[PDB]
Amino acid sequence: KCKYSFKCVNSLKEDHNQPLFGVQFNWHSKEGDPLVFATVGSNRVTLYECHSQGEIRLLQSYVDADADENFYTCAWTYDSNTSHPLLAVAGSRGIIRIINPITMQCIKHYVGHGNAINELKFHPRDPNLLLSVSKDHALRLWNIQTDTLVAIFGGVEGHRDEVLSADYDLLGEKIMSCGMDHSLKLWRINSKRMMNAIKESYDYNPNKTNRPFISQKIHFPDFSTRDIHRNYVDCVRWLGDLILSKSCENAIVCWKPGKMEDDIDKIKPSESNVTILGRFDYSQCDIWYMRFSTDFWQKMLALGNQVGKLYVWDLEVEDPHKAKCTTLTHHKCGAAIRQTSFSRDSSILIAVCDDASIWRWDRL
Amino acid sequence: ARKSAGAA
C-alpha cells in the first residue's frame, strides 16, 4: 500500500463561518522556527503555528478594509534582500496584497483590471516573480521587486473564460494554465522575448526615468488542448515534463502534450495530440474550485472532496498509473475541503473546509 | 457545474 500514514491530531474553526478557500504552509521558514501555515477565507488571511500534541496556535490576521473582499488564494515568498518571508493574498476584488507576515502589515498591493484573482504562484527560482490567474480570462506576471507588470497572457487564442489554476515547471521556464473553457494552455517564458522582458523589469526604476514600464502582451500559447477534461479545469501541477490536472469529474489525469516519445521542448503551437499516462479516480467532488496539493519533493499528492474525505496518493512509484492511494476520514469532518497543504518536511498535512474548520493530520 | 451545493 501507500508508504504514508497520517493520524488526525487536532481540528479547529474560525469565527467567521465562511469557506476557507486556501491554505498554504510557509516553505521558506528558517531552521528551528516552528512550522507556520496561512489560511484564506472571508475577507481575511490568518497565520497559525504548529506545535506538539497537535496544538495549532493562533497568531494574527490581516482583515481587509472592504467587507466585500473575499480572499481565495495565497502564496509565500521572501524578500530577496532581507531574508524575510512574504505572503501574497488575492480574491474577488482582483487586488494582489503583499503582506508582511510578522506584523501582518500590507506592505504594497497591485491592481490588475480589478476582477477576481483565482490563483497565485511564485517562480521556483526567482522569489520576485509572481503569477496571477484571473476571472478576466488573463494571466499576469509581476516583478514584486521593481513593482512592475512584466506580461499579460491573454488574447483571443488565450483563455475564453475564467482561468482557475496555473503552475510553473521545475526551472520556471514555462507555465501551464487551465480554466472554465475546458482547456489547458502552455506559455513558455524562456523565449528570447520573455527573458529580455524579465531583465528589463529588473532595470526599471520609475525615479531614474521618464518612461512607464511597457509590459508584454502574449496572445498565443505555445500549446493548447481541450481533450483532457469535459468540464471546468480547476487545478494544474507539473510533475516534471508531465501534467497533473483535474476538473469536477472526480478524476485527476496524468498527461503530456504530443505522442508518447515527444519531447516537451519540441512541442509546437499546432500540436494536436496528448497522451494519457494515467488517471486517479475518487468520489464526491463534482463542485468546482477544489484544489489538490503535493509535498515539496512531489512524493505524494493530497486532495479533499466535498463531504470531508481526504485522498493521498503515493507517487513514489515507477510509472504514474502505479500510484498508491490511501484515504483519511474523520467522523466529525463532513464539510467540503477546498485545499490541502503539506509542511516542507512532510510531517503535517492541513486540510481546510467550507464551514471554516481546519484539520491537522500528523504523519506516522 | 456549481461552486457549492446548488449555487449559480
Helix spans in chain A (H): 192-203
Whether the Cβ atoms of residue A249 and residue A229 lie closer than 8 Å to each other: yes
B4 touches chain A (CB under 8 A): yes
CA distances from A106 to A64, A109, A129, A201, A260 (A): 10, 7, 18, 23, 47
Experimental method: X-ray
Whether the Cβ atoms of residue A151 and residue A215 lie closer than 8 Å to each other: yes
Residue A103 CB partners (closer than 8 Å, separation 6+): none
Whether the Cβ atoms of residue A123 and residue A129 lie closer than 8 Å to each other: yes
Query: Does the beta-carbon distance from A289 to B5 stay under 8 Å?
Result: no
Q: For residue A333, give the nearest of A9, A100, A11 by alpha carbon.
A: A11
Number of domains in chain A: 1
CA distances from A301 to A4, A111, A152, A245, A291 (A): 11, 33, 30, 12, 11
Query: Grid coordinates standing for A179?
Result: 480554466
Region at A169 (left for phi over 0; alpha for psi -120 to 50; beta for the rest)? beta
Chain B interface, mutation test: which of A287, A289, A307, A353, most B Cβ atoms within 10 Å?
A: A287
Rg (CA), chain B: 4
In which element (H, E) is residue A134 found?
Answer: strand A129-134
β-strand A357-363 against A348-353: which pairing, if any? antiparallel
The distance of A287 to chain B (nearest Cα, Å) reads 5
Q: A296: how many CB neighbours lie within 10 A of its CB?
A: 12
- Chain B hits for A354, CB-CB cut-off 8 Å, are 4
Which residue has cell 493530520? A361
Query: Grid coordinates standing for A275?
Result: 497522451
> How far apart are the C-alpha atoms of A34 and A138, rounded to whole Å?
37
Whether the Cβ atoms of residue A193 and residue A216 lie closer than 8 Å to each other: yes
| C-alpha A46: how far from chain center | 17
Torsion sign over Cα A199, A204, A209, A211: positive
Q: A277: how many CB neighbours lie within 10 A of its CB?
A: 17
Q: A63: how many CB neighbours lie within 10 A of its CB?
A: 15
Q: A117: how many CB neighbours lie within 10 A of its CB?
A: 27
Amino acid sitting at position A203: D
Dump the DSSP string for A85-123. EEEEEEETT-EEEEE-TTT--EEEEEESSSS-EEEEEE-
Residue count (chain B): 8
Residue A258 CB burial class (10 angstroms; 0-12, 13-18, ≥19): middle
**Long-range own/partner contacts, residues A241-249 (CB < 8 A, 24 or more apart):** A241/A169, A242/A277, A242/A320, A243/A176, A243/A184, A244/A292, A244/A301, A245/A178, A245/A184, A246/A290, A246/A292, A246/A303, A247/A182, A247/A288, A248/A285, A248/A286, A248/A287, A248/A288, A248/A290, A248/B1, A249/A286
Give the nearest partner residue to B1 out of A19, A288, A306, using CB atoms.
A288
Which residue has cell 524578500? A79
From chain A residues 220-259, the ones with a CB under 8 A of any chain B CB are 231-232, 248
B8 touches chain A (CB under 8 A): no
Largest CA distance in chain B: 10
The distance of A178 to chain B (nearest Cα, Å) reads 16
Residue A184 is part of a domain; what is its CATH number?
2.130.10.10
Which residue has cell 481587509? A64
The distance of A188 to chain B (nearest Cα, Å) reads 30
Q: For residue A320, give the nearest of A298, A290, A288 by alpha carbon.
A: A298
In which element (H, E) is residue A71 found?
Answer: strand A71-78
Domain that holds residue A104: 1-364
Q: A157: how many CB neighbours lie within 10 A of its CB?
A: 13
CA of A249: which chain B residue's CA is closest?
B1
* Cα three-residue angle A260-A263-A267, rounded to 5 degrees: 100
Quote the DSSP letter at residue A239.
E
Query: Does the beta-carbon distance from A354 to B4 stay under 8 Å?
Result: yes
Residue A15 CB burial class (10 angstroms; 0-12, 13-18, ≥19): exposed
Q: What is the resolution of this structure in A?
A: 2.7
